[PDB]
């Protein structure tokens, strides 16, 4: 027995309950807490709200770890649990808890305590104070306490020191049950891991770890090494490191080598996801090379958010120079180390013009493989979320639902994301056009369908990358019956419905549309199809017509045997459903295109190219099977989550044999 403590921190994808384990093991250092409280297995997998609430039996404390993806459902769980147990202490923490609660407890009178920011100290003090004959919640630092419906702000939060020396839930065995649950249910999952806390920078849109603009604090060395071995010994294939700037600290290289050696010795992890440092440096490169050799790498972060000087000044971000970015791209490409760059659509002062020009400048600098875009969200505690900032830049938002809602689910259970869809610099019509533009760049250029053609036209015919993809959108949007035109127009109407119908889900957008879901059904059953997944597969379905219609657009540019030759190469290099790894795939060309796109001089040299790819995707785990459309989809585009941009879309030259004729 004892006072039962329930943790709830759910998400649609399985992530081990790190928060619950951290708070529990830190609090249990108090012998009174360890003796009096009976900590329950954390709830982290999604279930119907009523089922989840029914699973909480005689709770003394209900602890909710609240993010944008679970706030509404966890408030509903608390409401139902509070109804049945009037004396349960409901405490909510996490970055969706507002720093300034205001009228929070009027809207959520079933919540009793709000924890602000890092929660170890406050949670331990809460549980300790609850054991007293006269609990004094108004002395607990870093919390706000409900009195009636008023929020009584407690003393300022206390944080852990520069060297964080706290218990590890992994090493203490309290994460064993969560792994077992995932494995019992056959679920792929991520283990969460922190090596430090904080980001030293100040991007106004961001709320990373509730600790931007902060002095960095490190978890102790020995704990981290023990945890690396724990992950490896428990065959955790997928590791998610939460650091804001991996590579920013000298020891990050030693951590990277330790993970590579763990993979070599124990077979795990196989994939490590992490955000790499903003001010990318030699250490980031050394880490990426180490993980490339061990096949742990999921892509080196070289993110920009925006490239426009006024936008960056408005959001308090300094990027590396465009020429330094180009030099980085060359260095990584020479080692075949995958990089990626993120942009945010709708940032303060960003126009459709600057948005498209920035994208083109990134391709110009050498980013052809991985460009990612996110709709700007107003996070509760980001510096950008003030009435003054929103008014100054004219930010207009809609409460955007995140997921498709099963029929019969009450509307107060739908998670919402405060999404910007219009600014003073970007009207909503231009927002829609800009969103479609970069989606097309993703499935056409990153997706390879026109990447080599575009590079050839840029380097031999002076057709700029922005010009090329702007021309595609202008030309084909006026031609509704072409393959590409149908895609542009479907995206235009989708993204206008996306704004006008806040219920259309951010994370299941394709799946929410019956016609788009029907188009992808032969390729697989997924809730998480992305727009660029859908675009890539739609072209795969009508591949031959796509290329005949592409010729007509090329005529409008003033554009020949060499162009005819590179078009055949651009057609053959794409992965197709009939590809057989046993037989391979070969063709003959008037030029050595593999040598050219690897940096060589373009020469009229007749060559035979024989592609012999055996597998695709992360760790080469997807093997094509001719005629099997499901197997083709996995090899071509991988999983929708995690994002699959390494070893996909097209046949690779490293596996190709080029012989002279």
Ligand X SMILES: CC(C)(CO)[C@@H](O)C(=O)NCCC(=O)NCCS[C@@H]1C[C@H]2CC(=O)N2[C@@H]1C(=O)O
Tell the burial category of 476 from Cβ atoms under 10 Å away from its Cβ (0-12, 13-18, 19+): buried
Which string of x and - marks every residue 319-358 that binds ligand 5AD (by CB under 6 A)? Answer: -----------------------x-x--------------
User: Which partner, ligand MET, ligand B12, ligand SF4, none, binds residue 301 by CB below 5 to 8 Å per kind?
Assistant: ligand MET
User: By CB under 6 A, how many residues form the interface with ligand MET?
Assistant: 7
Interface characters, 506-545, with ligand X (x: CB under 6 A): -xx------------------xx-----------------
Tell me the two tokens of residue 441: 């760049």
- Torsion on CA atoms 230, 232, 234, 237, rounded to nearest 10: 130
For 446, 509, 521, 547, 650, the CA distances from 541, given in Å and listed in that order, are 18, 20, 12, 12, 15
Tokens of 96: 């969706």
- In the complex, minimum distance from the CB of residue 55 to ligand SF4, in angstroms, rounded to a whole number: 35
Q: Is 66 annotated as a binding residue?
A: no
CA–CA distances in Å: residue 71 to residues 108, 123, 264, 416, 417:
11, 19, 40, 9, 10
- Residue 278, binding choice from ligand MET, ligand 5AD, ligand X, none, Cβ under 5 to 8 Å by partner class: ligand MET
226 sits in which H/E element: helix 221-233
Strands 163-164, 150-153: pairing kind: unpaired
Is there binding between residue 301 and ligand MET (CB under 6 A)?
yes
Binding status of residue 208 toward ligand MET by CB under 6 A: yes
Q: Which does 508 bind (CB under 5 to 8 A by kind): ligand B12, ligand X, ligand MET, none?
A: ligand X
How far apart, in whole angstroms, are the C-alpha atoms of residue 210 and residue 120? Answer: 14
**Beta-bridge mates of residue 412:** none
Question: Going along 376-478, which residue ranges are E strands?
Answer: 396-401, 416-422
CA dist list (Å): 183 to 190, 448, 642 = 12, 36, 18
Q: Does 212 bind ligand SF4 (CB under 6 A)?
A: yes
If one asks whether residue 244 binds ligand SF4 (CB under 6 A), the answer comes out as yes
CA 397 to the chain's CA centroid: 21
612 touches ligand X (CB under 6 A) = no
Comparison of 275 and 655: residue with beta carbon closer to ligand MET: 275
Site string for ligand X, 455-494 (x = CB under 6 A): ----------------------------------------
> Which pair of tokens denotes residue 263?
């993979």
Residues 252 to 311 in contact with ligand SF4, rule: CB under 6 A: 278
Smaller CB separation from ligand 5AD, 384 or 510: 384
Smallest separation (angstroms) from ligand SF4 to the CB of 306: 11
Q: Using CB under 6 A as the criterion, which residues of the chain lie in contact with ligand B12 when the complex forms?
A: 11, 13, 15, 18-19, 22-23, 63-65, 67-69, 91, 93-96, 115, 118-120, 122-123, 192, 194, 206-210, 240, 242, 374, 377, 379-380, 506-507
CA distance 512 to 212: 35
Q: Does 278 bind ligand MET (CB under 6 A)?
A: yes
Q: Rounded to 5, what percent of the chain is helix, strand, coil?
A: 40, 15, 40
Which of the residues 293 through 312 are near ligand 5AD (CB under 6 A)?
Answer: 303, 305
Closest CA to 459 of 570, 588, 599: 599
Q: How many residues touch ligand 5AD (CB under 6 A)?
A: 11
Phi, psi values for residue 97, rounded to 5°: -70, 125
Tokens of 408: 């019969």
Where in 199-228 is the site for ligand 5AD (CB under 6 A)? Answer: 205-206
- CB of 54 closer than 8 Å to CB of 48: no
Q: With contacts defined by CB under 6 A, how many residues of the chain interact with ligand SF4?
A: 8
| Residue of 190, 195, 259, 249 whose CA lies nearest to 228 | 259
Task: Decide if residue 288 touches ligand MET (CB under 6 A).
Answer: no
Instruction: Give the range of 172-180, 344-352, 516-524, 636-644 binding ligand X by CB under 6 A.
Output: 636-644
The answer on whether 210 is annotated among ligand-binding residues is no
Pick from 89, 90, 206, 311 the residue near ligand SF4 by CB under 6 A: 206
361 annotated as ligand-binding: no
Site for ligand X (CB under 6 A): how many residues?
12
Q: Are 373 and 345 in contact (CB under 8 A)?
A: yes
**Which is nearer to ligand B12, 205 or 523 (by Cβ)?**
205
637 near ligand 5AD, judged by CB under 6 A: no
CA dist., res. 510 & res. 524, Å (int): 13
End-to-end CA distance of the chain: 81
Residue 628, classed as helix, strand or coil, is: coil
653 binds, among K ion, ligand SF4, ligand X, none (CB under 5 to 8 A by kind): none
Report helix, strand or coil for 652.
Answer: coil
For residue 60, give the H/E element and its range: strand 59-65
User: In angstroms, what is the minimal distance from the CB of 592 to ligand 5AD?
Assistant: 38
Q: Using the rule CB under 6 A, is 203 a contact of ligand SF4?
A: yes
| Residues near ligand X (CB under 6 A) | 12-13, 273, 275, 403, 507-508, 527-528, 641-643
| Residues near ligand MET (CB under 6 A) | 208, 244-245, 275, 278, 301, 303
| Residues near ligand SF4 (CB under 6 A) | 199, 201, 203, 206, 208, 212, 244, 278
List binding-site positions for cob(II)alamin.
Answer: 11, 65, 67-68, 96, 119-120, 207, 242
List binding-site positions.
Answer: 11, 65, 67-68, 96, 119-120, 199, 203, 205-207, 242, 305, 342, 377
């Amino acid at each position: 027995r004892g006072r039962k403590v329930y943790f709830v921190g759910l998400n649609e994808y399985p992530f081990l309950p790190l928060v619950a384990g951290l708070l529990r093991t830190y609090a249990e250092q108090d012998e009174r807490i360890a003796a009096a409280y009976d900590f329950q297995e954390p709830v982290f997998l999604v279930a119907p709200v009523q089922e989840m609430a029914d699973g909480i039996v005689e709770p003394d404390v209900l602890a909710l770890s609240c993010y944008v993806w679970n706030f509404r459902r966890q408030m509903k769980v608390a409401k139902l649990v509070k109804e049945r147990y009037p004396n349960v202490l409901v405490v909510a923490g996490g970055p969706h808890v507002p720093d300034r609660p205001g009228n929070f407890f009027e809207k959520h009178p079933y919540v009793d305590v709000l924890a602000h920011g890092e929660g170890e100290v406050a949670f331990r003090e809460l549980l300790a104070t609850r054991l007293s004959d006269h609990p004094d919640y108004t002395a607990v630092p870093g919390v706000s306490v409900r009195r009636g419906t008023e929020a009584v702000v407690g003393p300022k939060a206390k944080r852990l020191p520069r060297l964080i020396d706290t218990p590890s839930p992994y090493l203490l065995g309290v994460m064993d049950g969560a792994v077992a649950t995932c494995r019992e249910r056959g679920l792929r999952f991520y283990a969460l891991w922190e090596t430090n806390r904080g980001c030293p920078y100040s991007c106004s849109f961001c709320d990373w770890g509730s600790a931007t603009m902060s002095t960095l604090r490190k978890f102790e060395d020995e704990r981290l090494q023990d945890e690396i071995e724990w992950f490896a010994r428990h065959d955790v294939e997928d590791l998610f490191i939460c650091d804001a700037n991996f590579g920013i600290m000298p020891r990050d290289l030693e951590i990277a080598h330790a993970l590579a050696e763990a993979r070599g010795e124990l077979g795990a992890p196989r994939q490590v996801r992490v955000n790499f440092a903003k001010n990318s440096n030699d250490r980031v490169f050394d880490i990426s090379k180490t993980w490339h050799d061990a096949d742990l790498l999921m892509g080196t972060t070289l993110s920009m958010q925006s490239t426009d000087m006024d936008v960056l000044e408005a959001i308090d971000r300094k990027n590396i120079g465009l020429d330094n970015y180009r030099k980085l791209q060359q260095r990584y490409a020479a080692e075949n180390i995958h990089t990626y760059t993120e942009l945010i659509l709708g940032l303060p002062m960003e126009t459709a013009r600057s948005f498209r020009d920035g994208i083109g400048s990134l391709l110009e600098a050498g980013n052809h493989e991985d460009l990612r875009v996110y709709e700007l969200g107003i996070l509760p505690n980001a510096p950008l979320n003030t009435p003054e900032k929103i008014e100054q830049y004219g930010l207009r938002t809609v409460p955007k639902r995140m997921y498709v809602e099963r029929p019969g689910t009450p509307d107060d259970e739908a998670e919402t994301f405060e999404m910007v869809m219009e600014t003073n610099a970007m009207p909503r019509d231009a927002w829609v056009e800009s969103f479609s533009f970069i989606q097309a760049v993703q499935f056409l250029h990153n997706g390879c369908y026109t990447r080599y053609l575009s590079i050839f036209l840029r380097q031999e015919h002076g057709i700029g990358y922005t010009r090329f993809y702007e021309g595609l959108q202008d030309y084909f949007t006026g031609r509704p019956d072409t393959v590409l035109g149908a895609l542009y127009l479907r995206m235009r109407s989708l993204y206008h419905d996306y704004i006008d119908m806040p219920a259309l889900p951010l994370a299941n957008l394709v799946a929410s549309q019956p016609d788009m879901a029907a188009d992808l059904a032969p390729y697989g059953r997924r809730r998480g199809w992305t727009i660029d997944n859908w675009g890539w597969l739609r072209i795969a379905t009508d591949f031959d017509r796509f290329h005949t219609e592409l010729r007509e657009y090329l005529a409008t540019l003033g554009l020949d045997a060499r162009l005819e030759d590179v078009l055949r190469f651009q057609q053959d290099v794409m992965l197709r459903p009939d590809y057989s790894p046993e037989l391979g795939k070969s063709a003959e060309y008037a030029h050595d295109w593999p040598g050219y796109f690897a940096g060589g001089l373009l020469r009229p040299r007749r060559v035979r190219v024989a592609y012999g790819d055996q597998s695709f995707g992360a760790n080469g785990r997807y093997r094509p099977v001719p005629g099997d459309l499901k197997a083709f989809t996995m090899a071509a585009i991988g999983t929708s989550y995690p994002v699959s941009r390494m070893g996909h879309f097209c046949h690779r030259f490293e596996s190709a044999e080029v012989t002279s004729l």
